[PDB]
Amino acid sequence: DSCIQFTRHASDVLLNLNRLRSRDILTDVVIVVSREQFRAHKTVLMACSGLFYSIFTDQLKCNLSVINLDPEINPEGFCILLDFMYTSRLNLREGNIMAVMATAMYLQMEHVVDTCRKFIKASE
Amino acid sequence: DSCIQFTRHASDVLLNLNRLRSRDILTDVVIVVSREQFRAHKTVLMACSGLFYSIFTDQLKCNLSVINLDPEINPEGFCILLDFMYTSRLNLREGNIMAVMATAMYLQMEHVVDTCRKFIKASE
């Protein structure tokens, strides 16, 4: 086509989706990770995660307001990944890298899994 | 903070939100523009438009499944702007620029209004 493109548009959309998440606006699901609860938008979760894409395209699960994750999932690892989904920024630290990588593998977030593997390999 | 950032994350999220729109997945509103109907995600519309941000933060309008736009709004101008919201690409042409600018002013999409004004000024 002969379209023009606004470079900062995708980043501006994501920034606004994060603002709606912080103010709890039009969030339509709660993700339960052991004792912890996280409110989010189903569309954003599907757009970032192969696991959520599979769950919310399912004819019965698409209508659930609560999703319970596997009990082995660490709430802090989930929180870091949810923050990444809404911002593009990953808070990866020596103290959380193993939990972040295991959560990213479970959530099917291949680019996160890749950077965790590289950061681990460098420390070996 | 000490976060790392994935450069293509925002663009990848927007690409996936557009794929969900094309397959009509978890769309929660229909925008009526005279005889034409457009399905979309309320969160994306709010993230891109000052008008939709105002409508869907309203305690009564947030629950509507149908929104009727002003009859002066051109359906093609709306379609071009909806495509821009989901892709960052604006199909701006001599034959549609006046309708696109008027629709962007109504929708309160200031960056679109700005480029339309500049493209019009250059033709004068």
Binding site: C3, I4, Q5, T7 | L90
Partner: peptide, 4 residues
Amino acid sequence: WVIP
């Protein structure tokens, strides 16, 4: 704005 750019030419993509």
